[PDB]
Design a protein around this ligand. Structure first.
Ligand code: SPH
Ligand code: SPH
Ligand code: SPH
Lengths: 275, 58, 238, 252, 275, 60, 58, 275, 60, 58
């Protein structure tokens, strides 16, 4: 229970006190209250800065990527799909995270899996309930190269199984950084001779997910599309920075085209005219 | 092992119950009741602070 | 009855579950417990044991016992390099298959110091000196004994006490490295140089053998489970 | 100094002058079986002087090209006096051991042995789907020999030193209670070994409790005038031996 | 709450103390701390040897065998399947268990059952939900020899029934050894004359599982494939031993082909060159 | 077992959920916490900072 | 019949609740909070221990 | 917590005490301990007679009868099925109960219902979930004579409804005997002139179950087969008797053909020969 | 209502279950209990009784 | 209305919780922890008992 500050009453004044005259050249934001310039009354103010905290602002589930894979194909690479894990391919969650330079949060991951029967000649089937497998590979593990590969056993890797029609699968993930905060921006190189790649692509290194159908080759193609929802919780955030004006281009760099600073007015003084 | 704390209610006019069920601290719910702040490091970030009535750059 | 609500995560099978499950054989009388010597309560008890490092893994020396022998002898001038490898317990091919390399290859992050012990297996009448240097990265490899003596080093004299210990200090940016190879967490170079030569008397063999050991110190750690990169099966074991 | 060590077990004494220390198992010294861990119900047999004493095995010769040796040890003492007779007349046996290995040289010889005491050293075969005869895993007091290369004999252990007959790295074989015989400092290697098994007592013919292994990492080498014949002599003494279930003599 | 050891500060030294000189010929691992050789500072170290314990290392569910059986066939032996119970047919769980010689643990068993409609002419059916039966036979019990055999009654034997679409079936199993620990390796024979079989195949003797479809002969073939997941919990472990270098061959022996000790370097001294 | 009754709202995924969910990595040792200057606990700390207003936004 | 114990949290910055529901000890969860060790039987497995500063094989 | 008896140590003896000489002609079982004949040591014995009690021996669910009924037929008697309730048609649960003469136990009844689509010309249907009804009639109640009979209303009779795909239905039943124990054997007649029937068939009188499909006439025949599992709990048992050697013949009498007492040896003295 | 999560092992029938199940006949008056001589509380009471061994089982 | 009792554990190295939920005693679980016995009515079923060392039919 922390309220905002009340407005205290004031009266007429004539003295050498000057709250309105300041100097912003010291990098100092003036602490001028409205009871310093005009005559105000006493207002008991009951507003709470509640839904503006860093916890309430970021803790919302957000779609980060769409993953598509099928259940029977000629080519085996279209029967499973993978995704190198980053939060920088959807601009909403990325632009919400790029208010700060360093962040520290636990993650809550929820998958939403939907199935669509593809167009074929033999659509009149009776298919039992599909079961999907979502295997997480920590950085360095073995990579499956088919749906029938023996790396899908999950002897050590975390996994989750979902039968069609239930609630979405949900698990929590602790703070996984090797440093003390997830560096949203990294101004530096990868090699000590200042060559290689420039940006935050060196410090990503979070692992990658794998998706397949546990069932075998069916007699009709079905396209599965699973959506990943991240929810940052237990949040700490440091050293803020201005939001991005320009539209993004890629996931691995920060590059852009120059955009105008704001929308034009075509005049500079207001009037009671067509404004 | 239960904890009782107040709910988010309005002004001028509660006591829910929470029990943690998992062995890790990463399974707990979000801490959505920390309403404190300190804008003394963003506003007023200077040495030799100013007294708001003096000319201050006098 | 009691009104309840199912959350997401219901009816799934996570491999790291820690729930309770009913017994298939209720009231089963377990056999009593017997005190057996050599109980392991932590794999870090195993990883702190010395074990020999195959330094001489050069082009079919691995299909013999010669891969453990470090050749050393009398030199012509002075100051040549004996051997050398990179400090990667779990990615470097020298200490890959060592016990520290196995246990670190079931993990993904590591932290803490490393002991290197060198046993001289020559004759009782021979003497010699060596420079056991550690060099943190940022520069390259030290190319002579002058560039090697600018780092963490130790001069070892061969006498009655037959083995020395180079205790590699934990010098890092972060708290944990990676077991697999990346440019960001590189650890450095272990190198060995001739301080003075091997002086031997008459009627004694000149070429001798150094053995090498590795283990972890008391401040050592591992963090992230993963599967070992060594297990490779194709079919079942009928 | 602490380099002189003397051991008396029964009517046999070993005095060494260039010993190093004594490794005692996993910290546990051999003791008798208590009444809380006991399973059988009848009175055991504790001879304690006619049994607990040093038995000397065969000496083996160490050339420059020797690769290694092994002995199985509830079985190499089959024909060693009243320990072997009490093995033949009883059904359940339980003992600890003390393994002392002698090898001497001069200050002009070089070399280095590794004396390991490996519990449950279940060994491989030369041919993969083939059965091993019992004369090749053990032979009594006569040692079997490792080979430097891939051996492919009939009904024989896979004899390669870089896998120790067990399929592991031989450098990683130091997790077991071990010492080194370094010829510039050592003369001998004493290993006290308690009873390690999944059951409190076991039969001493059907089971092999452990396996002594002596593997030279640094090869033996000498000049053109030094002595060539260098033996290696192993001496073993059971400790806290007791016996249960007396019946007629045999093993079948 | 048990931390790792701190690093204590040290200064310059010149004396007859020699912590670096030792003798590894006594089988003794030197206890040299980095504050014995070089000058170190005071570091309050907060690392915990938590996820390296024997409990946290082995308690992960691992696939041990794949069991395949159908629902209608010409031959009755392909309508049910059985498996003699061992942990030594998948190399990952076997190589994790073979760090130790003797182990003592409770088991947690989870079955994952998936059904695939086989290829036929009459795939357009409307099949109700399949129900599977998993019957465990303790060593010595009667063996079913058909899907319609009267040994499937489970009057004394443990069993489990699963209807399609639910969560996977899970049960716990106590410590079942007749000795004091599961002997991972047995160096010995079966007969007292030292003949018979050599190895751990004498001490396996754990029983065997049986799998069938509770439903009768359907009008279309469906291939069921159930995967067994073991989870060792309440773990005690004794007398460690080095991990296996060589690739396995069979389940019943330990035999191998010789493999090189490590990967070759082709030089012996590092340099700043192409290394 | 215990007789219970499911209410409406069961088996749904609301974006503003605040429930508990099991960890995929149990007993994961988190790295320690370091005091970094410039911690933000509220966006209203950011919104109270002066910043320049583009008043002259007239036609390019 | 409940038991309260601490959770696995980090340093420099809990109290879950567990109730056992089955009649056997083989149904309980894994004991993933025993962090103790003793490497005195693998390292230092000797008689007449060494004092780390003496020559020790003096 | 009740242990078995320890073995006490003994020494050499020479006296007129004779524990080994007894006389079994008094119907007395000798209480000879092994420490009375030979020299034994002191053994602290921790075995528990736990899984040998009468509660742990009988409290296992056992199939007692198989009940088969269809969903559409020409004849109305094959669309419902009934069973006069007895535990004496499967030899395993019967032979486990016939260790004792009188028993007193609560019953726990579990039904396992499986459905199989019969062979016909029009197998390509879309059938909704079947619902089965299991009505218990206490002895004397009205008997339904069709699936559409108005005696299926269950105004007073106990009943249970199961929709396809759920868990098996389970209910508990108290001790229902009019005497003080379920008489496993009754040596006597039914009429006072010692005629009528001989055996336990007079004292059965437990009621009878009825099974039907709640759904109406479907357009394809489906054969339902429900299996009844009894679980005797809260058990008391009196006056034991030897187990049966011979194979059973019928449910209502105890009659048999003579069987040999045991399996032959063809010699009388062992040897070290082919034995 | 109360948020709950189903574990594996739900909706199965294990033969060695030891759960609670509702009665089909509530408030059924059980007949009283009578002391009958020869109560068995353990099969080991039966197995300790002497009984004759057929040693001469030789060919009919 | 809860009851706490010990679990079935082994020797040389618990406390589950049970609550009854139904109004009848026939709904309760099985009483699988009564380990007592008395073989004095099957063995030794005689008048004028015997003293195991005397000839007893002396
Ligand atoms: C299958 C169970 C485990 C599910 C694994 C899925 C996600 C694994 C990674 C957890 C979330 C990390 C996402 C990235 C966090 C930070 O926002 C980025 N480093 C950028 O700030
Ligand atoms: C149907 C319910 C019961 C399910 C029965 C399935 C498994 C039965 C055996 C339990 C697990 C024993 C597996 C073997 C344990 C040890 O790892 C091996 N002896 C080798 O170490
Ligand atoms: C539909 C709900 C009620 C279910 C009714 C099914 C079973 C009704 C009878 C209960 C069990 C009695 C079975 C016979 C008990 C004794 O074993 C026999 N009299 C022979 O000993």
């Amino acid at each position: 229970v922390v309220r905002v500050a009340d407005t205290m009453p004031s009266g007429p004044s004539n003295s050498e006190s000057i709250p309105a005259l300041t100097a912003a050249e010291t990098g100092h934001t003036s602490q001028v209250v409205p009871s310093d310039t005009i005559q105000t009354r006493h207002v008991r103010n009951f507003h709470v800065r509640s839904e503006s905290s860093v916890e309430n602002f970021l803790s919302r589930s957000a779609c980060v990527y769409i993953v598509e894979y099928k259940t029977r194909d000629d080519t085996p690479d279209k029967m499973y799909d993978s995704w190198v894990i980053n939060t920088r391919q959807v601009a909403q969650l990325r632009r919400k995270l790029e208010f700060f330079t360093y962040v520290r949060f636990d993650v809550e991951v929820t998958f939403v899996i939907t199935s669509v029967q593809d167009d074929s000649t033999r659509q009149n089937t009776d298919t039992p309930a599909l079961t999907h497998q979502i295997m997480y590979v920590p950085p360095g593990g073995p990579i499956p190269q088919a749906v029938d590969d023996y790396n899908w056993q999950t002897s050590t890797n975390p996994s989750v199984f979902w039968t069609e029609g239930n609630a979405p699968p949900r698990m929590s993930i602790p703070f996984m950084s090797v440093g003390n905060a997830y560096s949203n921006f990294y101004d530096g190189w990868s090699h000590f001779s200042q060559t290689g790649v420039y940006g935050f692509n060196t410090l990503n290194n979070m692992g990658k997910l794998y998706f397949r159908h546990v069932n075998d080759k069916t007699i009709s193609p079905i396209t599965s599309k699973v959506r990943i929802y991240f929810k940052p919780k237990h949040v700490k955030a440091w050293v803020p920075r201005p939001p991005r004006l320009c539209e993004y281009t890629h996931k691995d760099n920060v590059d852009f085209e120059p955009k105008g600073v704001t929308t034009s007015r075509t005049q500079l003084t207001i009037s009671n005219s067509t404004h | 092992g239960a904890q009782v704390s107040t709910q988010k209610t309005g002004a001028h006019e509660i006591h829910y119950t929470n029990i943690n069920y998992y062995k890790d601290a990463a399974s707990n719910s979000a801490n959505r009741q920390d309403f404190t702040q300190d804008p003394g490091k963003f506003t007023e970030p200077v040495k030799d602070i100013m007294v708001k009535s003096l000319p201050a750059l006098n | 009855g009691l009104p309840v609500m199912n959350t997401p995560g219901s009816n799934q099978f996570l491999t790291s579950d820690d729930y309770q499950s009913p017994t298939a054989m209720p009231q089963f009388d377990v056999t009593p417990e017997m005190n057996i010597p050599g109980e392991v309560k932590n794999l870090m008890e195993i990883a702190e044991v010395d074990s020999v490092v195959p330094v001489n893994n050069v082009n079919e020396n691995v299909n013999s016992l010669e891969a453990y022998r470090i050749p050393v002898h009398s030199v012509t001038e002075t100051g040549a390099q004996v051997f050398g490898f990179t400090l990667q317990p779990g990615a470097d091919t020298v200490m890959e298959r060592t016990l520290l390399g196995e246990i670190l290859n079931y993990y993904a992050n590591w932290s803490g110091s490393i002991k290197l012990t060198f046993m001289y297996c020559g004759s009782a009448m021979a003497t010699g000196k060596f420079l056991l240097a550690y060099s943190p990265p940022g520069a390259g490899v030290p190319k002579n004994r002058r560039e090697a003596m600018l780092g963490t080093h130790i001069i070892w004299d061969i006498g009655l006490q037959s083995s020395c210990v180079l205790c590699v200090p934990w010098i890092s940016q972060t708290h944990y490295r990676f077991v697999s190879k990346d440019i960001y967490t590189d650890a450095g170079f272990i190198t060995c140089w001739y301080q003075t030569s091997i002086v031997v008397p008459a009627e004694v063999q000149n070429q001798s053998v150094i053995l090498c050991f590795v283990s972890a110190c008391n401040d050592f750690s591992v963090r992230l489970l993963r599967d070992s990169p060594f297990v490779r099966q194709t079919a079942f074991y009928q | 100094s602490d380099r002189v060590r003397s051991i008396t077990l029964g009517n046999s004494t070993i005095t060494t002058q260039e010993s190093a220390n004594v490794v005692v198992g996993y910290g546990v010294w051999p003791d008798y079986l208590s009444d809380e861990e006991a399973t059988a119900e009848d009175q055991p047999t504790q001879p304690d002087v006619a049994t607990c004493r040093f038995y000397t095995l065969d000496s083996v010769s160490w050339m420059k090209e020797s690769q290694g040796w092994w002995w199985k040890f509830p079985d190499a003492l089959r024909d060693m006096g009243l320990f072997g007779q009490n093995m033949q007349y009883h059904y359940l046996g339980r003992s600890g051991y003390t393994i002392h290995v002698q090898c001497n040289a001069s200050k002009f010889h070089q070399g280095c042995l590794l004396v390991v005491c490996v519990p449950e050293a279940e060994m491989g075969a030369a041919n993969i789907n083939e059965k091993i005869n019992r004369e090749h895993l053990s032979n009594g007091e006569v040692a079997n020999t490792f080979s430097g290369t891939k051996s492919s004999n009939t009904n024989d252990v896979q004899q390669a030193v870089f896998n120790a007959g067990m399929g592991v790295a031989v450098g990683n074989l130091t997790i077991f209670p071990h010492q080194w015989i370094n010829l510039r400092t050592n003369n001998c290697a004493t290993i006290v070994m308690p009873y390690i098994n999944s059951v409190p007592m076991d039969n001493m013919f059907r089971h092999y409790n452990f396996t002594l292994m002596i593997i030279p990492f640094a090869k033996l080498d000498y000049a053109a005038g030094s002595s060539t014949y260098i033996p290696i002599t192993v001496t073993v003494a059971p400790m806290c031996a007791e016996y249960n279930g007396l019946r007629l003599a045999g093993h079948q």
